[PDB]
Amino acid sequence: VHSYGYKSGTRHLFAKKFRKHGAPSVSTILTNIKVGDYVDVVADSAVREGMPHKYYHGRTGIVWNVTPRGVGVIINKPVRTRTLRKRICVRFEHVRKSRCQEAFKAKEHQFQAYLAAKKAGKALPPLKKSSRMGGIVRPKNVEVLARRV
Amino acid sequence: QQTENFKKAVVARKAAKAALKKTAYLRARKYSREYRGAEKKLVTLRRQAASHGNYYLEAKPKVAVVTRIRGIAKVNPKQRKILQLLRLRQIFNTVFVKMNKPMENMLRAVEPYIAYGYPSLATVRAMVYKRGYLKINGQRVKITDNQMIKDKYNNADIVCAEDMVNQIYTCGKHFRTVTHGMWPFKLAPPAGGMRQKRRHFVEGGDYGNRDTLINRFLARMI
Amino acid sequence: KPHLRHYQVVGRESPSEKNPEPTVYKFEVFAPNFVVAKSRFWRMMRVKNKVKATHGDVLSCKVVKDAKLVARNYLVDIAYYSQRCGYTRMVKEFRDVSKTGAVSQAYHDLASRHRARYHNIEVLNVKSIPD
Amino acid sequence: NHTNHNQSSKNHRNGIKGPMPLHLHNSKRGSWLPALVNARRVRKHNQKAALKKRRERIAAFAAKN
Amino acid sequence: KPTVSKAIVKKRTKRFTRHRYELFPQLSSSWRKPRGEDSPVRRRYKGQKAMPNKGYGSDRATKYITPSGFRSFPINNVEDLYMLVMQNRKYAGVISHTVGARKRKAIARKAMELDVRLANGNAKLR
Amino acid sequence: DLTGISKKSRVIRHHTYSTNPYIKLLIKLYKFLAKRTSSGFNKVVYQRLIKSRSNRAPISLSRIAVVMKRKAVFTAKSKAAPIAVVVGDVLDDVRMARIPAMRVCALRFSKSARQSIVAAGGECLTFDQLAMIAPTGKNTYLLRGRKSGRESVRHFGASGVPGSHSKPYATNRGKETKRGRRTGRSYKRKAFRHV
RNA sequence: UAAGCCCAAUUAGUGAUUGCCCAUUAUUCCUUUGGUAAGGGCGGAAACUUGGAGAAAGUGUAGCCCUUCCGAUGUAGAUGUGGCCUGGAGGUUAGGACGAAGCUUAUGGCGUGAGCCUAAGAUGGACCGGCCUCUAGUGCAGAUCUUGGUUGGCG
RNA sequence: UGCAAGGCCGGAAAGAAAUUAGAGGCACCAAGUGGGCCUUCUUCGGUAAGCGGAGCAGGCGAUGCGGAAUGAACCGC
Ligand SMILES: [Mg+2]
Ligand SMILES: [Mg+2]
Ligand SMILES: [Mg+2]
Ligand SMILES: [Mg+2]
Ligand SMILES: [Mg+2]
Ligand SMILES: [Mg+2]
Ligand SMILES: [Mg+2]
Ligand SMILES: [Mg+2]
Ligand SMILES: [Mg+2]
């Protein structure tokens, strides 16, 4: 237990990736965050001022606080028998706007717009077709298999 | 005056019975002809294929029938939580189970413990009739009459016992209802024995998937 | 009485979302069951075709019928594995009635003298011999 | 003698309780002042409105009853 | 005076004695559970003597039923007979071994005059 | 048969540990009613009787007045005055001078709370007397009465944990306000912390 | 010319199943017991002979009565018991020279058990049982326990 | 003015992420424990070990039963 500093065992974790170093994006500076959206707290180095502790690196969570240049993010931390909603304070560059809901952001956007189209809408344009069923399949090349040595 | 309301509503004890064994009768044939028809229709599509130069891919098994074949001894906690969600809480608790993508991977992970396959029609009702129990008010109540079924499911479609079978034999529209409304099938150890229990069914043992050969395994257990 | 029937297992590769009509693969394997035939159907395609049992479907496995029960010769080109001289093939011409019969003797001979058992054993060219 | 054995199974007896939802302890406190000093004054008005909206109710519900 | 019907089968007959009870003239034929950490009885080996479970409980329908039917009820004087005479099918009196001889005759006289079966008597008259 | 279901069993308090012979009458009254009726009230008023004495917190007449004024402001204005049922007991409130003519049903009343009702114009009931008037408990406003702010519930906690405004168990009130409860004694128990 | 080894078998190439033996496992059947688990009665009627859909509004028992489900191991520990026991008190009921406590036991019975009750003493001689509360110097096999007594080795 | 923002809000909204859905949430009081060991998988140190130190899960401890002749741990249960 000789060393347990705030940045311990983190050579490869905060190290920038191969052939992508230097200053942060202009997207990451032109992001727009509110109190409530989700963010991937992907601590990048090359800013080295506002990086969170190692633990909060693959972690995503609500933004409970947006200061001028520091996003405050709550993150669930399974301590021992309970999770703490930790309240980390990082700068914006250590933050992505988390996709994690486009799975149903973009689903119910067109899913309702066609459920409405299917319930009332204007008309019901036919959609994606069935996937798994039978069929009298016609082959196009026969083959066999014994060995290759 | 009390012996009249009863005597009048004891007719409801009789009229609602005969008016229940008729709905039970009229659908149980419609289900049998779904069986007799859609199997005949399966043959021809496999007649026109093998004759005129095609292959009729046998569509898919919609439903699996998962029996836990090793006990509650030392079990990895992920192996153990899966079998708690399949309701395989003790040895030989055959349960009917869809084979979705999410589901069949819960079988992939606990195969050393389970022994599943695809249930024949003859083995789906053999389960339901000889060993079928319902969850009446949190109790394991045997399926003794069709009246026990409709009171428990209530879902406008599930009236008789051959009707629970058709919901189980096909992937059904009421399958999370007919199965979850039942207790896992506490079964007997198969007569004649098991070849092993530690090795897969393909390596001389017996577990994992035995496509359609679990009937020869459930017959000895029902 | 001889175990290990002869199965004709055939199958595509779940067509396809990429190729939409993958070539069909059929081969005949001796196996106790058909679950063991499909288990060794999806071992050839996983190896000789790089196709998973997941990403493919079995078209029609089938039990070959028989040959008119009458004695005849059989040379069975068989390939086993062992720490005993890893991956050696063999010929071991047997004289049994049916192909099922002779290949049975093939397995009960290798497991007898090389201790190589069913899954360490591939088979090829179960044919007959006039003289 | 550090072991960590039996600990993951101790944490899962009484369960690793899930986190509280956001409507628990959503104290926007210690956060950035110019927000909460505005999300304060707007709460004062919205309370004068909540009190006022109940004043007509009862008085409408009296005469119109 | 006759019993009421029952199903009097009994689970276990051999009493539960404590362990090593015969090896010592000091211990008692009275079950004390072995608190021993590695006693063979507590950890229930095969050829060891059993331990009172809930599982040995008599059928409740026939629990407390004397072999003559007639669940028992202790009787001290002839007035306690009348308090039993309504259950003279379900209960039987038992004189209390401290009631002397002068009073014990005054009881056994009344019992036959009441058909209140006593588990005690048969002195030239039952 | 592995279960895991070992600790899902809840402690429901099947019966009462009370020895008061006049509440074992109300309990048998409200097992009959709570069982052989389709009353939601009788269910609820029965678990509150078998409940203990520290859990049947008293409601003051103040609390009863105000909440019965918050009911009676939205009614038919001539329909009826519902009965304020409390399964604890009613205590007078010297902070409420004028009390309405409200009917109340409590297991008990203060001698100053019974006279305050009867002087006001209402009549305080009992539960053998409410089983005669709405036994199903139609038009009855069931009440608990605050059990927070109780001095027992505000010692619950640690009091040395950040964000723990609990009261330490200390007879001497001027004993423990030193180091640990001062910003200038090397640490001050952090009055706030997000949980 | 195996009862060894490696492969297979399972009634013998005749026609598709379980060769066969063993458990505190599984299934089913009874019985207990807990869940406060669900129900239903929770004061008088009949199926050929009796039992109960007449036994009391009830945590707890010799359960209010039925019947239904499910669980049932366990050291440290925790808790419950209308639960067991000893000394004594306040109540009640009651025994006793026609034999109380005690004591003996191949004296049975009955409670899962702690234990209780009985009988019979070619025992004992004068006190004492049940129940509800109260009370404590209240349960012993094991402390190189303490005291008394005996015993082996041992004539 | 209106966008966007916060605290709100009513009009309106439905699903044509599987399973178990063996009920969620807190709270209080109090023990015992704080010498573990074995094992699977992998692996640090050591000539090595029935070795020391770890990670994972399982066990034993605290537990029998069944059988590996025999065995705290193995195989079943
Ligand atoms: Mg075996
Ligand atoms: Mg006995
Ligand atoms: Mg206060
Ligand atoms: Mg004393
Ligand atoms: Mg003492
Ligand atoms: Mg002694
Ligand atoms: Mg001694
Ligand atoms: Mg074991
Ligand atoms: Mg050996």
From TrEMBL, chain A:
<dbReference type="InterPro" id="IPR008991">
    <property type="entry name" value="Translation_prot_SH3-like_sf"/>
</dbReference>
<dbReference type="GO" id="GO:0005840">
    <property type="term" value="C:ribosome"/>
</dbReference>
<dbReference type="GO" id="GO:1990904">
    <property type="term" value="C:ribonucleoprotein complex"/>
</dbReference>
<protein>
    <submittedName>
        <fullName>60S ribosomal protein L21, putative</fullName>
    </submittedName>
</protein>
<dbReference type="InterPro" id="IPR018259">
    <property type="entry name" value="Ribosomal_eL21_CS"/>
</dbReference>
<comment type="similarity">
    <text>Belongs to the eukaryotic ribosomal protein eL21 family.</text>
</comment>
<dbReference type="GO" id="GO:0006412">
    <property type="term" value="P:translation"/>
</dbReference>
<dbReference type="InterPro" id="IPR036948">
    <property type="entry name" value="Ribosomal_eL21_sf"/>
</dbReference>
<dbReference type="InterPro" id="IPR001147">
    <property type="entry name" value="Ribosomal_eL21"/>
</dbReference>
<keyword id="KW-0689">Ribosomal protein</keyword>
<dbReference type="GO" id="GO:0003735">
    <property type="term" value="F:structural constituent of ribosome"/>
</dbReference>
<dbReference type="Pfam" id="PF01157">
    <property type="entry name" value="Ribosomal_L21e"/>
</dbReference>
Automatic annotation (TrEMBL), chain B:
<comment type="similarity">
    <text>Belongs to the universal ribosomal protein uL30 family.</text>
</comment>
<dbReference type="GO" id="GO:0000463">
    <property type="term" value="P:maturation of LSU-rRNA from tricistronic rRNA transcript (SSU-rRNA, 5.8S rRNA, LSU-rRNA)"/>
</dbReference>
<dbReference type="InterPro" id="IPR036919">
    <property type="entry name" value="Ribo_uL30_ferredoxin-like_sf"/>
</dbReference>
<dbReference type="InterPro" id="IPR039699">
    <property type="entry name" value="Ribosomal_uL30"/>
</dbReference>
<feature type="domain" description="Large ribosomal subunit protein uL30-like ferredoxin-like fold">
    <location>
        <begin position="65"/>
        <end position="114"/>
    </location>
</feature>
<dbReference type="GO" id="GO:0022625">
    <property type="term" value="C:cytosolic large ribosomal subunit"/>
</dbReference>
<dbReference type="Pfam" id="PF08079">
    <property type="entry name" value="Ribosomal_L30_N"/>
</dbReference>
<feature type="domain" description="Large ribosomal subunit protein uL30 N-terminal eukaryotes">
    <location>
        <begin position="1"/>
        <end position="59"/>
    </location>
</feature>
<keyword id="KW-0687">Ribonucleoprotein</keyword>
<dbReference type="InterPro" id="IPR005998">
    <property type="entry name" value="Ribosomal_uL30_euk"/>
</dbReference>
<dbReference type="GO" id="GO:0003723">
    <property type="term" value="F:RNA binding"/>
</dbReference>
<dbReference type="InterPro" id="IPR018038">
    <property type="entry name" value="Ribosomal_uL30_CS"/>
</dbReference>
Automatic annotation (TrEMBL), chain C:
<keyword id="KW-0689">Ribosomal protein</keyword>
<dbReference type="GO" id="GO:0003735">
    <property type="term" value="F:structural constituent of ribosome"/>
</dbReference>
<feature type="domain" description="Large ribosomal subunit protein eL20">
    <location>
        <begin position="5"/>
        <end position="127"/>
    </location>
</feature>
<dbReference type="GO" id="GO:1990904">
    <property type="term" value="C:ribonucleoprotein complex"/>
</dbReference>
<dbReference type="GO" id="GO:0005840">
    <property type="term" value="C:ribosome"/>
</dbReference>
<keyword id="KW-0687">Ribonucleoprotein</keyword>
<dbReference type="GO" id="GO:0006412">
    <property type="term" value="P:translation"/>
</dbReference>
<protein>
    <recommendedName>
        <fullName>60S ribosomal protein L18a</fullName>
    </recommendedName>
</protein>
<comment type="similarity">
    <text>Belongs to the eukaryotic ribosomal protein eL20 family.</text>
</comment>
From TrEMBL, chain F:
<dbReference type="GO" id="GO:0006412">
    <property type="term" value="P:translation"/>
</dbReference>
<keyword id="KW-0689">Ribosomal protein</keyword>
<dbReference type="InterPro" id="IPR021131">
    <property type="entry name" value="Ribosomal_uL15/eL18"/>
</dbReference>
<protein>
    <submittedName>
        <fullName>60S ribosomal protein L18, putative</fullName>
    </submittedName>
</protein>
<feature type="domain" description="Large ribosomal subunit protein uL15/eL18">
    <location>
        <begin position="1"/>
        <end position="188"/>
    </location>
</feature>
<feature type="region of interest" description="Disordered">
    <location>
        <begin position="154"/>
        <end position="195"/>
    </location>
</feature>
<keyword id="KW-0687">Ribonucleoprotein</keyword>
<feature type="compositionally biased region" description="Basic residues">
    <location>
        <begin position="176"/>
        <end position="195"/>
    </location>
</feature>
<dbReference type="GO" id="GO:0003723">
    <property type="term" value="F:RNA binding"/>
</dbReference>
<comment type="similarity">
    <text>Belongs to the eukaryotic ribosomal protein eL18 family.</text>
</comment>
<dbReference type="InterPro" id="IPR036227">
    <property type="entry name" value="Ribosomal_uL15/eL18_sf"/>
</dbReference>
<dbReference type="GO" id="GO:0003735">
    <property type="term" value="F:structural constituent of ribosome"/>
</dbReference>
